[model samples]
Target: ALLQVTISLSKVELSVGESKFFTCTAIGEPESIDWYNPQGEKIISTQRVVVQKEGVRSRLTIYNANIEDAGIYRCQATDAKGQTQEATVVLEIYQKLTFREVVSPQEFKQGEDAEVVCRVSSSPAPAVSWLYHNEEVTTISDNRFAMLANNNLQILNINKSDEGIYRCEGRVEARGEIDFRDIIVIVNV
Candidate 1:
């Protein structure tokens, strides 16, 4: 007995800044299928949409979904026999942090310490990294700086030479997936 079928992802949850993949499968001879977004906007972009055929099953993969990517997605599959099947998947973007500068006061006296915190709340826990003047400056790199928990960057012994952009970089690897974040700071000499 031969079967023609189409399927979509069930209710799936994704944290903010995280990405989830939804695949649609069809059994039988692959013909024409159209994928659409909630607003009838075809998400069939060349860069992000992928379609492949394997034996009697076909698959579609969506990658790197952001906040704007949160919505309902539909896939319409058709076969040579004029048979059609459709499936829909709802996407949700969870909570994430707004990447911005945490440095303040615009002035730090020499030999003084200043604190910069990069606040982030994300699913799967985001890894926070820091860069001073575009260079990786974890506390390990220099004793003058400290990488604190809760995604905060602290710099002690402030001086005219320390007057530059202080940036925070956050990244996470979950299930072999990675995401990145960066913050900037400006100091007055």
Candidate 2:
């Protein structure tokens, strides 16, 4: 009998922390159907990743997927001598915007360095900026503020005028996703 393989999900785009699975079914009985990762690396069941096979069909499931897991997934079904069939699916992972717990209220004394925090991150890495008192700004344009690592922002030499709500803007133009969050600031003269 001639051997043929069919697969579902030619490509999958999903956000982080989501569960996704790819399907592969085979025609004509032969051997086991196995799943592989990028470059034909064999796949195995893990705490969060599962490989399921029933008869000539196999499925691969990944739970709470991360960016590092993004790659081309493959499925293979082997038959008699010199007989094999395979299919592949492109997988991509995206991280949604989220805020890290830093110092809120960002309280500071007069004439002191106010290291305002802009705790945010995203997959494909967002170009983070701040909205000062409802106005958009970035450290690139403002020397008074310095951009910190991990997308944090620092406001130099705090004064009463600097005390207000600081909004953190996250942009992922790569995926057309935009998200922003706010943190209130305070100053003591």
> Would you list the clashing residue pairs of candidate 2?
none
Which ranges of candidate 2 are over 4 A from the true structure? Answer: 80-82, 133-150, 154-157
- Model 2 — which ten-residue stretch has the worst lDDT? 133-142
Q: Each candidate's TM vs. the true structure?
A: 0.46, 0.78
87-139: candidate 1 lDDT, tens digit per residue: 78888765553455444434555666777666654555777776665354443
Write candidate 2's Cα lDDT for 1-189 as tens digits: 326787888988999898998889888885778888875679889989899888878989999988778889888888766578888899988888776775667778989887777777887788887767645443345677766776776778877877888777889888888888777889999
Highest TM-score scorer: 2
Question: What TM-score does candidate 2 reach?
Answer: 0.78
Q: Name the lDDT value of residue 50 in candidate 2.
A: 95
